[PDB]
């Protein structure tokens, strides 16, 4: 699978690993997405759904799971229709530490 883990328990919710599936995914290189977003708002463009990314956003602020369909576009610009999956990760403390987020190219051929 593509994806990244973000930490739960900071603004923003920051990259702590991509996996090499996302990297190709994308066109960034790990090095380029760490510390950036998990919700990957520097992939989106003009004509992503605002309401969208929305909703994203509240997934995060709630640590909660939650699946949606978004467009977002590679670095060399590429359109992308992506499905996004954000799953919470807990600790001992049943605590949400991160997010493991997993994108998949649902752009019909």
Known sequence: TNFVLGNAQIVDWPIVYSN??????????RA????KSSTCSFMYGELTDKDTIEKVRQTFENYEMNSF?????????????????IAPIRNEQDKVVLFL?????????
């Open 20 to 29: 090499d599936g996302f990297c190709k995914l994308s066109g960034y290189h």
């Open 32 to 35: 380029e997405v760490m510390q």
């Open 69 to 85: 369909e978004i467009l977002m576009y590679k670095k060399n610009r590429t359109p992308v229709w992506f499905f996004v999956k």
């Open 101 to 109: 987020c997993t994108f998949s190219d649902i752009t019909a051929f």
